[PDB]
């Protein structure tokens, strides 16, 4: 009934938030195999003009199959609208509500032995702030948009002045979605602040606090800076696009790059804010199935906060050919450089968590496993990127997709299936089927790899991003990586399939902690599921 | 001239150099590429033995040790070890890339939905670069007879589609060439991977790139920035060729 989307408990939104996210999901993730079936091959067979001719029914099926060449007139502005959709979806819509809204909304407080949220009714109306965002972005695909077709073709950072001369009001209905987000996500922010501050348990003090509850925390702080300088840089473009405002167009004395310097003073933060959480659940996951106290627990937490203050002035490594003195360029360079310290210290602290343990190889530790090699992976690629005089190279290319996609698909997404099945007994009462967590797994593991890898190459090669067509020469990796995401996808439609067992008939959770004594904290002393009114 | 700056089929590496600026590039990423495989397969190794050695079959109680300094200190310091070392190599890579030298030959280039404009000031010579099967050519973005012919008769072949514009900005060879870049309507990006260079092409803004080609070919490059609906089809071309062939072409474009 809807007596859930009304419902103002902490554990009752924190599961809101993970299925929406997972919803959300499916659908951004639905993009990208129509995406990769267009990248399969050089020239354009789906994407065709002549698709629009049919109606908003007809003609989705019809772009489905592939056509000749010579009767697929390119549709470059669908390609964009495609992956700008994709982008925001992620960004704003996916990952971030659902390990910072889901899990850190039903587990935070509980770490912390909280029984209740300081504000339940701002925790409630920050999920439906996330909900008419959603569709609110959603809606901007079928409005009047950029070259008298539907939706906004910009890319998900919306740079002028190309964001600000499209046409329709796509655009600006995807501007709404975001302040729509960035509302949500602070309010949320305040929310988990005021809780972590004023609602521990007696004895619950700073330094015994579980390191979940510590990535929920520092993830916070970087949204209350962050989300209200991106509210800034869209509102300008709101302006400019509506009300006369010349913030971003030269005739007027205004500087398209000013945008890009406020856009990436939010647009680096939020990737910590990504990731911040997932390296919390990796921590919980990895203790307990090596039977063993996460090494070095204060480095833990002050290697987080660091990282979260050295996201803030580094910005313009997403900027290094946007027109920055050479003076800017070399600053940037070694202050992003610095980030790959106190990562490191996070990732040794985990094999050394590891060392000496006895270890269990059930699913939640695979994922956390592959994390660390993958996001391993992703991080140093983020340093060759990191080096301005190589990113002149690659930028905007396919190497630098190849960079996010390990931290974040590879990174951020291992530590949300990770958690998934380390909690989902927790939540729900029921457990999920080991055999089919393994199979999961496996098939996302080297799917993943496949579609992503390859991508090094064809950015070494030097095919840019953005591109619904690309020369006959990138046809061979392009095409490994279109098989990996077909095969990625399998894997996701059987997971949802794992979680639609899992919850309508998995073994039925009979103990408190199903897993060791090692999984030590607070939500493994309730009932699974927790009761209604906690500790 | 010989086709040289291009994509290859299954290409795992970068374009062919033909500048200093280029091959400098090519060293600095090799040599961090050495070092970030390394450190890969090394975290990589450190997991794997972690796994076979501590599984539970094999280690039936657990360690409890949270600390080891010595241990540390050392993955503390090697990282920060590692990072200046790259520093060091790197910034004077950078140091070279973005000092603009004296100019043999000047290009000012403009960034148009969706085209290249090129002017030369010295010689007071402007035009501007369609992609070989845009509208301008009579196309619309896809291969076709008509397309592989006039790839053909403008000196390229079907494999070119995509990347070869009507006309070329020509240079010569062994010459220091200054562009100053900016944007007539949108950002543009222009780059050309052979020659190690990119800059955006920014509304208001003149921004400069210099290279300096060491051979004679055909250097090909595609627009970088995402700027609407053709952003995949405005490429660039690059001829580069002898002192002499250069003037030759000036002057064909003399109006006397
Ligand atoms: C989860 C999200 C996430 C995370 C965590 C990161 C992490 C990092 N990012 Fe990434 N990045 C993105 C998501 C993310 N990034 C996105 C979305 C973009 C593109 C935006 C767009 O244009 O659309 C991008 C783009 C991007 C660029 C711009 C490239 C370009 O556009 O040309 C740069 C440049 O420096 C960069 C750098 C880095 C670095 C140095 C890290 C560091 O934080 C990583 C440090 C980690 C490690 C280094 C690995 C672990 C460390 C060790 C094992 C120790 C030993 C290692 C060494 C000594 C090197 N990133
Ligand atoms: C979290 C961030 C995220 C994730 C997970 C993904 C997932 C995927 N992306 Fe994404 N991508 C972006 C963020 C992300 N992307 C961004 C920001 C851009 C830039 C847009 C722009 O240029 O403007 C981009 C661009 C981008 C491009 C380049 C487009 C271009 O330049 O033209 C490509 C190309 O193949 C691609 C492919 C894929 C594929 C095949 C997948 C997936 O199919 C890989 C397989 C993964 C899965 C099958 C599982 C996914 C799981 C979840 C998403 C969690 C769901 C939640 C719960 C279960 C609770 N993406
Ligand atoms: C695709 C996203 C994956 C989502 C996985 C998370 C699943 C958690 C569902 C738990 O739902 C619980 O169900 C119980 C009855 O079983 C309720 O009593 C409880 O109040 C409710 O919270
Ligand atoms: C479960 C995953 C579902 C993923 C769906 C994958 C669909 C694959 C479509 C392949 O169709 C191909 O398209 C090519 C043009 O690109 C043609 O050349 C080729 O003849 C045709 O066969
Ligand atoms: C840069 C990559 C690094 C990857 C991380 C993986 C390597 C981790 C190695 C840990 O080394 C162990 O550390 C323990 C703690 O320091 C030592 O125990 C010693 O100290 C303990 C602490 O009291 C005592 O209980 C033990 O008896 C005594 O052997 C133990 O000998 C040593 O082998
Ligand atoms: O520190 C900076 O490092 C640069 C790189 O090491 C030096 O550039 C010096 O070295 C570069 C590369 O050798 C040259 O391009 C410069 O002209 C020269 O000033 C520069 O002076 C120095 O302040
Ligand atoms: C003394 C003589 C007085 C002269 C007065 C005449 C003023 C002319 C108005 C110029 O505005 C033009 O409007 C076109 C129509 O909107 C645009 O075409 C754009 O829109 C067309 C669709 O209508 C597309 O076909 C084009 O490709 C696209 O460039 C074009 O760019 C833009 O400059
Ligand atoms: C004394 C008074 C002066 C008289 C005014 C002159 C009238 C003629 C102006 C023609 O305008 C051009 O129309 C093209 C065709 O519409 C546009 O191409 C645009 O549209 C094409 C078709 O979509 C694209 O392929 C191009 O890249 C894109 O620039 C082009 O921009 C625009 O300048
Ligand atoms: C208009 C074509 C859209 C196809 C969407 C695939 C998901
Ligand atoms: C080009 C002729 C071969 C036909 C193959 C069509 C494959 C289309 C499958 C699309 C699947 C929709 C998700
Ligand atoms: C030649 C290397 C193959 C890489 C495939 C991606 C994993
Ligand atoms: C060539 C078509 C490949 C389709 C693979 C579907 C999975
Ligand atoms: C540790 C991540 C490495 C990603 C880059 C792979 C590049 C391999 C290119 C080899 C060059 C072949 C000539
Ligand atoms: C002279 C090289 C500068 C290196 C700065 C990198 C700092 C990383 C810690
Ligand atoms: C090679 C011939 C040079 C001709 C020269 O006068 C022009 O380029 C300048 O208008
Ligand atoms: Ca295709
Ligand atoms: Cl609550
Ligand atoms: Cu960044
Ligand atoms: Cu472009
Ligand atoms: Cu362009
Ligand atoms: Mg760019
Ligand atoms: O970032």
């Known amino acids: 009934f809807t007596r859930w989307f009304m419902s103002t408990n902490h554990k009752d939104i924190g599961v809101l938030y993970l299925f929406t996210g997972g919803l959300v999901g499916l659908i951004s993730v639905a993009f990208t195999v129509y995406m990769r079936m267009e990248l399969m091959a050089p020239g354009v067979q789906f994407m065709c003009a002549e698709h629009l001719e049919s109606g908003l029914v007809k003609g989705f099926f019809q772009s489905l199959w592939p056509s000749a060449v010579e009767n697929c007139t390119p549709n470059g502005h669908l390609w964009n609208v495609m992956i700008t959709g994709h982008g925001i979806l992620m960004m704003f819509f996916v990952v971030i509500p659902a390990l910072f809204g889901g899990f850190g909304n039903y587990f935070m407080p509980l770490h912390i032995g909280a029984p209740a949220m300081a504000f339940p009714r701002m925790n409630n109306l920050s999920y439906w702030l996330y909900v008419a965002g959603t569709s609110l972005a959603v809606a901007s695909l079928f409005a009047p948009g950029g070259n008298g077709q539907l939706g906004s073709g910009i890319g998900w950072v919306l740079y002028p002045p190309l964001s600000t001369s499209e046409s329709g009001y796509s655009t600006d209905l995807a501007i709404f979605a975001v302040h729509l987000s960035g509302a949500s996500s602070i309010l949320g922010a305040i929310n988990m602040i005021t809780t972590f501050l004023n609602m521990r348990a007696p004895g619950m003090t700073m330094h015994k606090v579980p390191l979940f509850a510590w990535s929920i925390f520092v993830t916070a702080w970087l949204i209350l800076l962050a989300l209200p300088v991106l509210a800034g840089a869209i509102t300008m ?25 406020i856009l990436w003073f939010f647009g680096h933060p939020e990737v910590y804010i990504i990731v911040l959480p997932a390296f919390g659940i990796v921590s919980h996951v990895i203790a307990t199935f090596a039977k063993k106290p996460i090494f070095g627990y204060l480095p833990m937490v002050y290697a987080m906060v660091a990282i979260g203050v050295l996201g803030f002035v580094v910005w313009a490594h997403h900027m290094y050919t946007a027109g920055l003195s050479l003076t800017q360029q ?100 029921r457990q999920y089927p080991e055999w089919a967590g393994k199979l999961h797994f496996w098939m996302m593991f080297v799917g993943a790899n496949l579609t992503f890898f390859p991508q090094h190459f064809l950015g070494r090669q030097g095919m840019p991003r953005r591109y619904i067509d690309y020369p006959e020469a990138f046809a061979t990796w392009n095409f490994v990586s279109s098989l990996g995401a077909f095969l990625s996808f399998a894997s996701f439609l059987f997971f949802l399939g794992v979680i639609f067992y899992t919850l309508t008939r998995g073994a039925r959770v009979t103990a408190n902690n199903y897993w060791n004594e090692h999984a030590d904290t607070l939500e493994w002393t309730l009932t699974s599921p927790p009761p209604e009114h906690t500790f | 001239l010989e086709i040289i700056g291009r994509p ?56 409890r040790f949270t600390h080891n300094s010595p241990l540390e200190i050392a993955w503390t310091i090697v990282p920060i070890v590692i990072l200046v070392a790259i520093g060091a190599f790197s910034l004077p890579v950078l140091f070279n890339q973005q000092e603009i030298p004296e100019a043999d030959v000047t290009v000012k280039v403009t960034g148009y939905q969706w085209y290249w404009g090129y002017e030369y000031p010295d010689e007071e010579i402007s035009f501007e670069s369609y992609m070989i099967g845009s509208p301008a050519t009579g196309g619309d973005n896809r291969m076709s007879p008509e397309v592989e012919q006039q790839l053909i008769e403008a000196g390229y072949s079907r494999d070119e589609f995509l990347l070869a514009t009507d006309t070329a900005m020509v240079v010569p060879v062994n010459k220091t060439v200054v562009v100053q870049v900016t944007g007539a309507d949108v950002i543009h990006s222009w780059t050309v991977p052979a020659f190690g260079v990119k800059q955006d092409a920014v509304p208001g803004r003149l921004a400069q790139l210099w290279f300096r080609a060491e051979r004679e070919g055909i250097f090909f490059g595609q627009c970088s920035e995402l700027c609407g609906i053709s952003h995949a089809y405005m490429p660039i071309t690059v001829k580069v060729v002898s002192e002499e062939a250069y003037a030759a072409w000036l002057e064909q474009h003399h109006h006397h």
């Open chain 1, 237 to 261: 473009l709101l302006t400019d696009r509506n009300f006369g405002t010349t913030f971003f167009q030269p005739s007027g004395g205004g500087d398209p790059v000013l945008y890009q310097h």
């Open chain 2, 8 to 63: 290859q089929p299954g290409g795992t590496g970068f374009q062919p150099s033909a500048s200093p600026v280029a091959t400098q590039i090519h060293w600095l990423d090799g040599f961090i590429l050495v070092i970030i495989a390394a450190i890969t397969i090394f975290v990589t190794l450190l997991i794997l033995y972690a796994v076979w050695r501590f599984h539970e079959k094999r280690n039936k109680v657990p360690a």
């Open chain 1, 330 to 429: 070399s600053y940037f360079m070694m202050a992003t450089m610095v980030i790959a310290v106190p990562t490191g210290i996070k990732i040794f602290s985990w094999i050394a968590t590891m060392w000496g343990g006895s270890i269990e190889l059930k699913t939640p530790m695979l994922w956390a496993l592959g994390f660390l090699f993958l996001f391993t992976v992703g991080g140093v690629t983020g340093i060759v990127l990191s080096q301005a005089s190589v990113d002149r190279y690659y930028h905007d290319t396919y190497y630098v997709v190849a960079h996010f996609h390990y931290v974040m698909s590879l990174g951020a997404v291992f530590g949300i299936f990770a958690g998934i099945y380390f909690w989902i007994g927790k939540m729900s009462g």
